[PDB]
Each structure stands twice: as C-alpha cells, then as structure tokens.
Design an enzyme around this catalytic site. Structure first.
Site, short mmCIF file in Angstrom:
data_model
loop_
_atom_site.label_atom_id
_atom_site.label_comp_id
_atom_site.label_asym_id
_atom_site.label_seq_id
_atom_site.Cartn_x
_atom_site.Cartn_y
_atom_site.Cartn_z
N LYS A 184 -29.11 5.82 8.76
CA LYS A 184 -29.17 7.08 9.47
C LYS A 184 -30.59 7.33 9.89
CE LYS A 184 -24.82 7.50 8.53
NZ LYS A 184 -24.75 6.16 7.93
C1 LIG Z 1 -19.83 10.56 10.68
C2 LIG Z 1 -20.08 10.19 9.23
N1 LIG Z 1 -19.59 10.96 8.24
C3 LIG Z 1 -19.74 10.72 6.94
C4 LIG Z 1 -20.42 9.59 6.48
C5 LIG Z 1 -20.56 9.38 5.00
O1 LIG Z 1 -21.96 9.38 4.69
P1 LIG Z 1 -22.42 8.64 3.35
O2 LIG Z 1 -21.56 9.00 2.15
O3 LIG Z 1 -23.88 8.96 3.14
O4 LIG Z 1 -22.16 7.15 3.56
C6 LIG Z 1 -20.97 8.72 7.41
C7 LIG Z 1 -21.68 7.50 7.01
N2 LIG Z 1 -21.40 6.40 7.74
C8 LIG Z 1 -21.97 5.06 7.52
C9 LIG Z 1 -21.33 4.14 8.51
C10 LIG Z 1 -21.81 2.74 8.27
N3 LIG Z 1 -21.15 1.95 9.31
C11 LIG Z 1 -21.51 2.26 6.85
O5 LIG Z 1 -21.98 0.91 6.82
C12 LIG Z 1 -22.31 3.16 5.87
O6 LIG Z 1 -22.21 2.88 4.47
C13 LIG Z 1 -22.00 4.64 6.02
O7 LIG Z 1 -23.14 5.32 5.43
C14 LIG Z 1 -20.76 8.94 8.88
O8 LIG Z 1 -21.29 8.18 9.77
#
Ligand SMILES: Cc1ncc(COP(=O)(O)O)c(CN[C@@H]2C[C@H](N)[C@@H](O)[C@H](O)[C@H]2O)c1O
Ligand SMILES: Cc1ncc(COP(=O)(O)O)c(CN[C@@H]2C[C@H](N)[C@@H](O)[C@H](O)[C@H]2O)c1O
Lengths: 414, 414
Positions: free
Chosen positions: A199
C-alpha cells in the site's frame, strides 16, 4: 522476438524499491524501544502513545476529528462493519471486483455479501447496480476506491442517504486521494485503510478507521481493545489507559507502538510520493492511449487520484484469443517488473470458498445466501479477462521508465 | 498509616522498565527498513523473511517442527481453532478463569464456549470439570497455563485422547515453561502464544501457533494469509512467495516483518529473563508464606515455571470482607507498582457481553447456548474474590525488591 518465447528482454534492470523508509523512522523506533510501552494495552508512562500521535495526525490529514488505528485493513473493515451494527444475516453490498478480503470480511461478521457489478471504465461500484441490489435486508454499502480510481461518491452518497444506509469507504488503495477536495474516507459513514506492505502508506502491516462520528469511533475503540477504550484524561503513570468500560464487547485488533510510530513518519512523505506517481501516470496514460489501450479512469468529481496500482485494459480486437495470464507473463518478461492480471471477480476467486469453512456452516438458508454461484458480474469478468495492472513502485521512477512500460506493451501487441 | 488512607507510602522508587529491548533490535529493524519487503505478503526479494526466521527459531525453541507466526494471541487462538475444524455451533471447553479473549475467541469462530472450573491451587483447568462438561457436541478443549502455573497436562491429554478431542494449549502466559522436560505448547495438538506488550516475549503486538503436525500448520498458514501459503521453495525475486493454492479460505492475520525481527532478537534473552523472575519468585514465595499468604502453585510434573504474573491468595480469615479491589488498591499505593485483583471469571466479566454484538445473533438456540448466565464456577469465583496479582516486571529486580513487596503486604494486612 518475445522474451517469454526466448527472445531478448527490453528491460531487466531493477525498478524502484518499495517501501521507501522515511528519514525519521529509526529515531521513532528507538524512542518506542525505550518507552516502556510497546502497545496501547500497556500501562500509561506519562507521555502520549504513538498509537494516539498517529491517530491524531491521520485524522488531521484526512480532515476529520476521529481515527482509530488498527492491526490491518481486514480488521479495519470488520471494526467499521460491526460499529455500524452489522451482524448475522444482514446484507452488505460490495463490489465484485476487489481483493478477496472485501468478501471475506463481510462473511467474518456473519453478514451476507451482495456482490455488485462495477463501472466498465472506473471499475468502481456501479450506482445503478447498487440500487438494483438493495433488498429489505440490506444494512450497509461498502465501496472500494479500486487501484487508482475513486467511485461515484455523489451517486453513492445519494443512494445511501435516501435509503438510510451507512456507506463505508474502503480506501486501502486510495490513501490521500480526494473527491471534491474532501479526503477519501471522510465523505460518508467511515473510512477504512490497509497499511500492508504493498500500500502507498505502509508499516508492513496495519490499518485505521476514520470518522466524523464520536460515538462511532468509540464503538470502534471498544471493538479493537476487548471492550475497552481510552480514558478521556490520561491516568497516573503505571495505570492502564484503556479502561474496562464494557459498553460493547470487542476483540484485540490493536496496532503496536512500532507500527504506529512508523506510520506517523511515513505519512509525512505520502503526498510527495503520490505526486511523483500521479505525474508519471499522466505521462503513461498518453503513451498507452497512442497504442489503443484504455487506462482506468476516475469518477466525475474526483479531484486527486492515488495510484496504488496502474490498471489498463487491452485494446478490443488485439490478442483477444490469448489468455490474460499469458499476455501478463509476456509483459512481465519484457519489463523486468510484474505485470499482473486484474483480480478475479470475488465470487469466482479460488480464494473465496465459504463452503470449505465450518465457521460459516449456519444452516441451509444461510448456505444458499452465501453460495458464490448466485453472482454473475459481467463487467468484473470482462475486466478480469482484459485488464492488466502494475504495482505503483513502477510509477516512482523517471519519466523514461514510462517509455519502457509503453515499449513493452507495443512489443507484446505484436 | 496506609498511603491510600492519607499516610506515607513504603516505596516510591521506580520499578524495572518493561519491555527490555534486546541489543540486536535496532540493526534488525534497519535491515527490515532497507529490505524492500515489510511483510510476507510482499514479493520475495532473494532472502529469507524475518517471519520465516522467527518462525524457525520459535519452533526449534519449543522442540517442534512447525511454527506459524501471527498478529496476536487472539488471532493465534482463532487460527488454531479453525485449523482443528471448529465451526458454527461446536462446543469448546475452556477454563472459567482467564483473560476475556479465551471466551471471545471461541465465540468468534461461531462456537459455543463451555467454561469449566479450575483447580483451587494452580488455578488451571480442572480435569474433573472437563470430564463432567463433555457432550456429544464437544469438538475441542482449550487449556490455559495461567499466570505462573502449568495445567495437569497428563490428566488433560488423557481425557483428550479418550474422547478423541484436540487439546490446544494457550501458552500466552507461559513462554518457555516446561512440563516433564517438554516445552509448553509442544504437549498436545497445538500451542498458541501472545506477544502483546505485557507478555514475557513481546513485540507490542504479536503471536504464534506451533504444532508438530505439518498439515495443521499448512492449514494455519492458509488461515492467516487469505487462503495462501508460502511456497515450498522460494520463487524468483519479485514474485509472490505466498501462493494462492485454493486449498483453504482464510483471512489476513500476518505478522509484520518489523515485529518478526523484534521477536527473533527478544527470543535470545528470554531464558535469562525467565531465570531472574524464577529466582526472585522463589524467594518471594517464602516471605509471603511467612505472612500466611498462599502463592499460586503449579501442576506436578512442571520442570520449570514462567512467571507472566505473580498471583497470591490472601490468608483465610483475614480482611475476609474487604473487597479485593480495595486491598489491591492499598497495596499499589504502598508499593508504587500496580497490584490487581485476579481476572474475574469470564462469564462474570463485564467485558464479556455476547448480547451486545449482533454478529452472534444466530438464532434463539445459539443465543441461549452462548449466554454466560448459564454458568456456575465456584472455584473461579472464590479465587477471584481472594487473589491479587503483580505483573512480572516486579520480578526483574533484586531481593530488596521482594522485601518491598512483602513489606507492603505486611503493612496492608493491618
Ligand atoms: C480494498 C482492500 N480492502 C481490504 C484489504 C485488506 O487489507 P489488509 O488486511 O491489510 O491485507 C486490502 C488489502 N489488499 C491486498 C491485496 C494484495 N493483492 C494482497 O497480496 C495483500 O496481502 C493484501 O494486503 C484491499 O486492497
Ligand atoms: C491466556 C491468553 N490468551 C489469549 C490472549 C490474547 O492475546 P492478544 O490478542 O495478544 O492480546 C491473552 C492476552 N492477554 C492480555 C491480558 C491483559 N490483561 C490485557 O490488558 C492485554 O491487552 C491482553 O493482551 C492471554 O493472556
């Protein structure tokens, strides 16, 4: 000619490193190390926790009075959900096209995600799709500002206000972006953020909930500290600053002092970084347009965009028989940097398998409701077949880098 | 004469700071800072992640092949539960006396916690209570090594095995303790750990799951990384190391690289710090015994104790109608260090209110089963009414420090 079929790569040198550590981080971490308080749940020690300093700064930055930091964007979603009163059997409207967490979080508080199709140009939740999907069970709308676009907030706020529904902005991919000059996440019920590695604002892992509503943030606070919330006034040294008020049961979704200190420092270079991306992306949209590619657009009303990811659709009538993974693989090979397909639509994602998980086995009606076979999402599916993406590290270099990106795309188009 | 009742306190000098940073941390963290990978969910960059380094360290530290790190002791529990296949409506046996998360974690996977009474002297889960509480709906037993004591694991394993029930050790308060020579958390199905601020091993926030069953670990892995698992062998640099296997849906409960690195450093001194606490506690046991107090005891077979907290029952027929809060408030003011009542029993804990979270409103039969009013825990109730506690920072000083403690007790006791 193509590197994937043994040709010469256009480029193999490294792209910009991510993350970019802010200069103040080692000092801020050292100060944490010596503080005698490494989480908010440790006793008060006479000065303000980095959890609070960050909360203050992130709130100010988004132009709202309240922020509750949190462990992850997943946690932030779930806290915001439960603070809206969302619980078992409630329908939550979400876009079909997002990272899988957008569906699993709704599941995790026992609600029923109602996946809605997206706009073909911006790939953000279609307002027309939202109205059509509202039922008498609907209790919230989650909107994702996906990749580099903002959603149509004037239309969505309109539908939320008419129906008396909370509208949560998932700004995990949009930190610092603005619609009508208001910072994204400050436009509706509550804003939700990831600070995971990839991010634009990051501490490896982290998150936050933002809101203008005091009672909302207070509920959020309870939900992230096992039914406790910070005292109005600090207590004496050695006493717990989190008080067992018990207004509402919670769990632990706290952010550590280390991560809070890191985010406060990373926040001070956020806009400068977003400016670098923004300018490079303006350059690329042109180069790629000349090739017949269609970059993702933003909704009318957007005043500034945050490029978490550059998303671009392949030209109609070009490589239409080649699977996108092949196209994206060949691009990756030319460029020296991953170029990946768009996310699969969530109900068709192999990571979304709610019948495999006994937590969600709540009897037949609920199993019908959460069966992902019920959801057909034409625009999401098309976008998934046709759209490739690059992570924003690729937008942090020189204007010349953009030339390389365009060169790779041109090569692969023949 | 009491400090609290206007008088002169016995001690105002400060107590040992906690946490004590290990000397390798700043360098470790600086290494993270420049690594280009701040979480495991970031792409591989040609070297082992600190998550892997810590994981392997903590597995080996405990005598077991597998460790999956996680965001908190709360996540760790919930991971372990779901990896045992626990889901909606399953009963899970747990001690009545513990931090509230022991209850709410079960509730969070849609299971029905079944609080059981504890041993009056060790305060750990009673075998007879467990046996009495078994039903055809029971799918697991969770046991806590509470404060400074270990449970009767031979007795608990035997019941587990008779009934074909997995047995999870919550070792949040017992890092490095050993029962019959074997590291706590290596004795049954799986071990869960909190690395929250106050714990003996800490990164402000953190946790782990450890197990000797490879399949179980693989399931935990999936469950913490949104249905993904680290590849058997590393990919090329720039490629994702977490792979979307499709085997098992999950959520994000990853631990950041920053925390992982801190825990690897703090691991290196844990044994030494445990020795210090151990010797101070031994000496204090005697002093407090001579005052008629009864220190918490440990189960037969314990080969060494970890003191997360020093617990002690007030003498019978003494202050036997002064509220514990009042006694504990008086000791605190005498000592210049917080002394607190034991946990309430979870069903009587004001933080424990299922009715407040619409998430759990799964239907009348479910709601009744999760109502804490159904429970009666006479030993937990009695211990809670008569036991006070000191966090383990008190045990990191001299024998003079122990005398201050005794001298505060002596004084309060009139
Ligand atoms: C719109 C949206 N809503 C909630 C989340 C959840 O955030 P986190 O729990 O910090 O992963 C994400 C994270 N998304 C990413 C997407 C990435 N492709 C993947 O490899 C990674 O682990 C994850 O952090 C998102 O993009
Ligand atoms: C037996 C046991 N099981 C699971 C947990 C949950 O671990 P976390 O999610 O890391 O807090 C704890 C932590 N318990 C502590 C207890 C402490 N009184 C409180 O102020 C603090 O926030 C909490 O971490 C525990 O002791």
């Amino acid at each position: 000619q193509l590197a994937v079929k043994g040709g010469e790569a256009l480029r193999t040198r490294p792209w910009p490193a991510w993350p970019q550590p802010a200069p103040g981080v080692p000092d801020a971490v050292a100060d944490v190390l010596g503080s005698g308080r490494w989480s908010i749940s440790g006793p008060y020690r006479g000065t303000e926790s980095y959890e609070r300093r960050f909360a203050r700064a992130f709130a100010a930055y988004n132009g709202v009075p309240h922020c509750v930091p949190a462990a992850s964007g997943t946690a932030s979603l779930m806290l915001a959900l439960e603070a809206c009163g969302i619980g078992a059997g409630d329908e939550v409207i979400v876009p079909g096209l997002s990272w899988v967490a957008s569906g699993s979080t709704i599941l995790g508080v026992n609600a029923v995600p109602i996946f809605c199709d997206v706009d073909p140009d911006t790939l953000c939740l279609s307002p027309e799709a939202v109205e059509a999907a509202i039922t008498e069970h609907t209790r919230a709308i989650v909107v994702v500002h996906l990749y580099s676009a903002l959603a149509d907030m004037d239309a969505l706020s309109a539908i939320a206000e008419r129906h008396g529904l909370p509208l949560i902005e998932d700004c995990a991919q949009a930190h610092g972006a603005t619609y009508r000059g208001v910072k994204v996440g400050a436009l509706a019920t509550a804003g939700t953020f990831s600070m995971q590695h990839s991010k634009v604002l990051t501490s490896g892992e982290g998150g936050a909930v933002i809101t203008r509503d005091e009672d909302f943030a207070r509920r959020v606070e309870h939900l992230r500290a096992d039914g406790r919330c910070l005292s109005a006034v600090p207590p004496a040294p050695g006493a717990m600053e989190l008080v067992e008020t018990g207004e509402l049961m919670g769990n632990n979704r706290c952010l550590s002092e280390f991560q809070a200190a890191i985010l406060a420092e990373q926040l001070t270079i956020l806009d400068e970084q977003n400016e670098t991306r923004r300018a490079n992306a303006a350059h690329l949209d042109g180069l790629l347009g000349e090739l017949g590619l269609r970059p993702q657009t933003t909704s009318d009303g957007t005043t500034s965009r945050t490029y978490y990811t550059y998303a671009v659709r392949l030209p109609d009538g070009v490589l239409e028989d080649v699977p996108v993974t092949d196209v994206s693989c060949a691009l990756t090979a030319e460029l020296g940097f991953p170029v990946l397909p768009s996310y699969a639509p969530i109900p068709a994602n192999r990571l979304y398998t709610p019948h495999t998980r006994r937590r969600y086995t709540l009897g037949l009606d609920h199993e019908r409701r959460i069966d992902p076979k019920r959801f057909a999402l034409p625009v999401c599916e098309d976008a998934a077949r046709r759209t490739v993406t690059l992570h924003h590290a690729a937008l942090l270099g020189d204007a010349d880098d953009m030339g390389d990106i365009a060169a790779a795309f041109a090569k692969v188009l023949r």
